[model samples]
Target: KVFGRCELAAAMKRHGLDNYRGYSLGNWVCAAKFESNFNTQATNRNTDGSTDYGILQINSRWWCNDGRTPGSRNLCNIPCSALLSSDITASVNCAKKIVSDGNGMNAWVAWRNRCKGTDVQAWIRGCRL
Candidate 1:
């Protein structure tokens, strides 16, 4: 399922993502736009031989394995497809776990490489939430 920008903004706010783990909603929303465009089923193959899953692009390495991939630690202890669901409760929980290690959003390469210096406020523009 894909979420509209306003809907995403609202959901993020609902999920406490507006100030999750000390990360900004603007940066998170920007990263989501660039990563998956808010599509829950979005997936991208990585150069490291793992795939990125869900809106946040959680990796298979420290997260979940796709079953076809070997050597995955599955640190999140959930299936990779678990992150692909429209109901993002598990995804959000896992994301919080990912950020809990003090790495913040750096675990998301796109967030570190792009959203940090980008005009993130634009991603949430026109959203009253």
Candidate 2:
């Protein structure tokens, strides 16, 4: 089922991402798919065995365990596992904050460029608040 507005808002508030009211859920979904293939607990191991966490692949070690609070470390502390547990809206919002300050949809563009290697503005063409 599609997440409710209250749930999505709470999740965004928890992550300090209150500026994505105009963002397209579909674009967020596409970005997440490109970023971590929608795997909430997904992680990437570097050559040295260091790992990145979550659907957004945030490096928890950098945002967490480094003296940052959970709320302050929404993108940093919370592992992909925790983010994955929330819902698609939470995952997409997490990525949205990381891309922009919750302002524009630059994250979607960035993800398309990095992963798909092509512009996907079409996703946000007719998107509305």
Candidate 3:
């Protein structure tokens, strides 16, 4: 499912992402925009044979086991396929794990380039979160 702005915001907030790692719901929303444009099934293959999966684009190298990435860390200890579901529980939980590990929101480059150093609150400005 391609979540609507407010839908995504509420979802994230419910999953404890609102103020996670000092990043607001807006920051999470903005990162979701750039990461996979809110598409739950989004997937991107990296040149290194790893792949990014789902809305937050969690990578196989460190976060998931795709059974293909050469040196899979599988830190999230989940199959990469689990991330493709429209039910974002797995995705959100894994993201929280990433943040709790001190990576912050910079775990994804899309966040750093597009969501970081910007007025992130604007991403959810019109949404009633």
Candidate 4:
């Protein structure tokens, strides 16, 4: 599923991403816009031989077990396919764990490069949050 900007923002809020780990819903929405364009089925292969999965592009190397990443830690304890579901519950769970693990939103390069320190509120403008 590909979410509209405001729709994605609302979904993230429902999953408790709003202000989770000190990052706003806009932060998450902006990262998703750049990382996966709000598409749940998105995937990107890294030069390191790992693949990123789903909306936030969670990496297989340290997060989910894709069976292809050489040193997969599976810290999220979920199959990489779980991230592909539009339901988003599993992805959100793993994402929260990623932040709770102390990496923060900086764990996502897209967030650092595109969303960090920017006027992220625009990502959720007029979305009755």
Q: For each candidate, what is the lDDT?
A: 0.84, 0.47, 0.92, 0.93
- Check candidate 1 and list the clashing pairs: none
lDDT of 4 by residue, 21-59 (tens): 888888999999999989999999999999999999999
Please, what are the lDDT tens digits per residue for candidate 2 over residues 1-129? 233334433444555443355543444545545656655666565453335555555544433222332333434334445554645554555555465554354534435565343443443344333
Sort the predicted structures by lDDT, highest score first: 4, 3, 1, 2
Q: Residue 25 lDDT in model 1?
A: 84
* lDDT at position 56, candidate 3: 95
Give the winner by TM-score: 1 or 4: 4
lDDT of 3 by residue, 1-129 (tens): 999988999899889898888888899999999999999999999999999999999999999999999999999999999999999999999998998887688788999998889888888788776
Worst 10 residues of 3 by lDDT: 120-129
Between candidates 2 and 4, the one scoring higher on lDDT is: 4
1-129: candidate 1 lDDT, tens digit per residue: 998888888888888787788777888788787788889999999787899999889989778868866689888888988899898777888888888867888888878888887777788889998
Kindly give the number of clashing pairs for every candidate.
0, 1, 0, 0
On TM-score, the candidate that comes out on top is 4
Q: TM-scores, in order shown? A: 0.89, 0.44, 0.96, 0.97
Candidate 2 wrong stretches, greater than 4 Å? 1-26, 65-81, 84-97, 100-129
**Candidate 1 accuracy as lDDT:** 0.84
- Give the clashing pairs for model 4: none
List residue ranges in candidate 4 displaced over 4 A.
none
